[PDB]
Symmetry: C6
């Protein structure tokens, strides 16, 4: 039974049946405001507080200052974790992504990070305007992350709740695990739901499970 690392996110370990596979890549996809960024922070936060596992958060759009400010919403002082050397926020914003895939390796080995979060991968391709080389590029990242033995959570974007899993119809096949966050609207009201669509070489709960965002972060309800 492939080894998993407990995420400690209320409910997720029940749905995943132990947490996220170690050294494997997990895609957390969702429409805007589904809780993709939040999930990836709480994945790094819980690893530091509950198992003293150093974390790397790579951001292509939001700035370290903003990721911190927005985290203070949930009573998390990411400012302190940065000083203590437990967390590292890599800013990869714009002024073959082998230039960046090496910059992350340098931080992982430097900080000795077990957990990694990339948010959001899609933007790199949407910034470079190169929707051709996506399956090849996303694979070079996942593969180079698999060689360092690091448990990774990458977020992607989508336009619909029951349409393609991601934006290019390929990211689901380059990742080991696939988690889908939905914010479905029916009758003028929204319903947040989480779903582990796939986990390679391990069991998990199927279908969508309700969750809500509170002052303590994500809280999923196993049924």
């Amino acid at each position: 039974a492939i080894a998993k690392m407990r995420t400690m996110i209320e409910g997720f370990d029940d749905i995943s049946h132990g947490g996220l596979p170690i050294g494997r890549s997990t895609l957390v996809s969702g429409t805007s405001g589904t809780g993709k960024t939040l999930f990836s922070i709480q994945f790094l936060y819980n690893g530091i507080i509950e198992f003293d596992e150093p974390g790397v958060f790579v951001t292509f759009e939001e700035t370290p200052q903003d990721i911190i400010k927005n985290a203070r919403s949930f009573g998390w002082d990411l400012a302190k974790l940065v000083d203590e050397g437990k967390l590292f926020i890599l800013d990869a914003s714009p002024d073959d992504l082998s230039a960046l895939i090496e910059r992350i390796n340098y931080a992982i080995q430097k900080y000795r990070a077990r957990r990694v979060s990339i948010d959001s991968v899609t933007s790199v391709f949407q910034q470079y305007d190169a929707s051709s080389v996506v399956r090849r590029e996303l694979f070079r990242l996942v593969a180079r992350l698999k060689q360092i033995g690091a448990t990774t959570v990458m977020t992607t974007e989508r336009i619909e709740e029951y349409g393609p899993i991601a934006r290019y119809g390929v990211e689901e096949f380059v990742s080991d695990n696939v988690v889908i966050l939905r914010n479905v609207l029916e009758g003028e009201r929204r319903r947040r739901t989480l779903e582990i669509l796939k986990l390679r070489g391990t069991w998990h709960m199927k279908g969508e499970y309700p969750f809500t965002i509170t002052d303590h972060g994500i809280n999923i309800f196993p049924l």
Copy 2:
């Protein structure tokens, strides 16, 4: 956590739970005739009248005169406010947008502006056929305004009521906040609803809430 300024739009400060996050940009998407322009004016107007916060209105298609004429409808004397140096209308009528971002930055400092609104970003990218660089250039704009520390309202256009949030399916991800105006047709009648889809770092009411455009602007109805 993140502070927010009151828009003073009847009902909106209840949905948003205090107003719009300060120094962050908010996207207001919608089909044609949903109230995007009204929203961006009422934002700037209220900020000047109730708080003395100066503001800058960026227009791409509509002319300054048209904006002043259309606003007189609600008893808002925008012309007066331009003379006082309280409101400034930047005309951006007719691939990079750095020249634009610098002109907005100049007005902001020249008028000591607190609030800003662009209406509408989409049209700029369509008037130059530069559609493969929207996420790049929109981010450059939203990133600059963040440094200047201005609360910005950007309006975007959509073609469907329950389809993509914006035109190119990217604008939603670059903005900190996302408001969605709707004008749904069902049974040969129209229903106007507003939804705050996302507010980064803060809480807000979820789902779409009804509103109407009265003789005194937008009026939203919270349900709890």
Copy 3:
């Protein structure tokens, strides 16, 4: 309150609440055979008969001879109105076209204008040229009705998904098929700076042109 000119089309002036905003462009979009041309004609016709306001008609496919033949169907004598210099039909069957229109508006002193249809010019960069025309017509200060085509009754407003945002006002004409039967409805989607009735309202085409039925 923005001033409006009465179209004199039965029902429409109730829905629009006085008529079309003066000096602005109004998009009239519809599928094939919805009454786009008819609306454009009736607009100019009623302007001449009811207020002696001269009119200009820009045609991009139908010839002036067919526009007059098709108008005779409703008992209108466009040939007479032309011969009096009260109506001008510019046969165009985008900067060079504006020069043709501006010369005609000034020559005839035309307060109303109809363009049928804008879309065809492109199918024969749409936001740029559409905005060029609409911006120019505004500077001249003429009230315009531009017709536009569509394929679906409840799909895009126009054909490119841009025309709706370039026009100050939008009117959608529908001819919906339900249970092998056709229902004609008109709707004012948007009017910048002024109020109007929302939703679709039933209408018919008779021997006196379009007749809309405002509900309340």
Copy 4:
């Protein structure tokens, strides 16, 4: 606006006189809806009923095939040809060449009625300018003053009127032929969507293809 009687049972009722004279009419429809049969009858009825000569223009099917297929309804097209009342123009990037060739036949035969089947096929034989070229034909035919029936093809029954979403706007009139499937069964319906400068009945009307051709039931 004057109308000529098509003599197709029911059509002159739905159209309220027939087809606007000197105008072009589009007959759009999916495969096997009866676009060809409609265009043959328009000509045939004109020849036998009013001695109005007819010009049929075919891009795909051969003049021998169009005759062999009509003999199934008891129509002798070979006779109308030998008489010099019907002409079958075999037309198996501009359409100006075709327009001139078509005008030769109209003038030669002193034809009043014309039918083209089908204009879609010429544009795929790859000029997907169709509006510009389809307007060149319609404008010239309107200059000649010949009442024309041009068939067009479509893929969906309740989708676009034609194939390129343009043809319908260039034509003076539009007739949609449908062959809708439901419960594993097919129902044939005809509808006049548009008749410029004149009145007509709205909605779809049932019809069948008998051994005597098209027959439409006008409910009203």
Copy 5:
């Protein structure tokens, strides 16, 4: 009164009302596994075993080895019919060149029937499909042989073929469906169109058995 050629497929000659029109092209479109190949094999097989009519089968993907093996599932020795000269499988695994090879085969074997499975496989050459399909169909008509061309489609109630052009280039059109509803499949055949002649309309239930295709007429 266009004369028909009996296909000898149980039920089809009732739906078609005599069979397929002689010297015409019949389009048999259908999604994957609807019986397209099987139909075209029975057309030749039945023609040879009953009317002594030599057949020319054209294949662009399938090998003449696999076609003979597949037919042998229904007790059809296409090998023996090949030896006698009554059948001739033309392998076209890699367009006026093919028409010369086909007209050669039809004339060289004094053949009445023809099958082409499938015309979709031939065509990035999509901008000349109508033109090239019309070149073939026109060449086949002038030759004077009854042809059966199969075509592919994606949806059961979507386009009749794969390009929205083959349906009009052909004289006759048969649509084979394999509709899925409630986790079960439902095979039906439909003659959408037959030029110059009458046929039965709508879908008709059919099954594939040890004796080939079996259609159920409701009339």
Copy 6:
């Protein structure tokens, strides 16, 4: 009749009425996480442990280590079979497929292999921007047919009731077509397998429920 080799995957040989046709290619199409890879492993694993039949696995995305690591959860010692020379994982990780067609032909002949799994044929054309698929795939199908190998090729999907594969050509190139579904209704998923087509042989029609237990795929014939 067309000869078939038993897959030994519970229920499959009932639906297929004997197994997969010998020397013919079979397409296994499905959305992400439907069980395509798992199906392609169990195929080769069952052939070896039951019939001592050597198999080759052509992997594009997953590494040889992961395919083995993932199989451990079902108690399948894939590492042992690589050492015993009964299984070979061809690492095809990084428009012509000729180099691959010869590498595969080498492994087939060099290991006396009769079963072949290719996971997944769609990824190659995405990784090389070759979206010449009907052209290239036909070369692969034709080659494998000549060599005399029973092949399982998995294709990707986006919709459960839409196109069978990604390009709408792969279904017509293959001799046989299996479809895996993971349909969502009422917030709950449901796994079903379907044999869409089998050239020259009979099979059970429609969708059949299945699950993925501690011993692989289990299908329930109805």
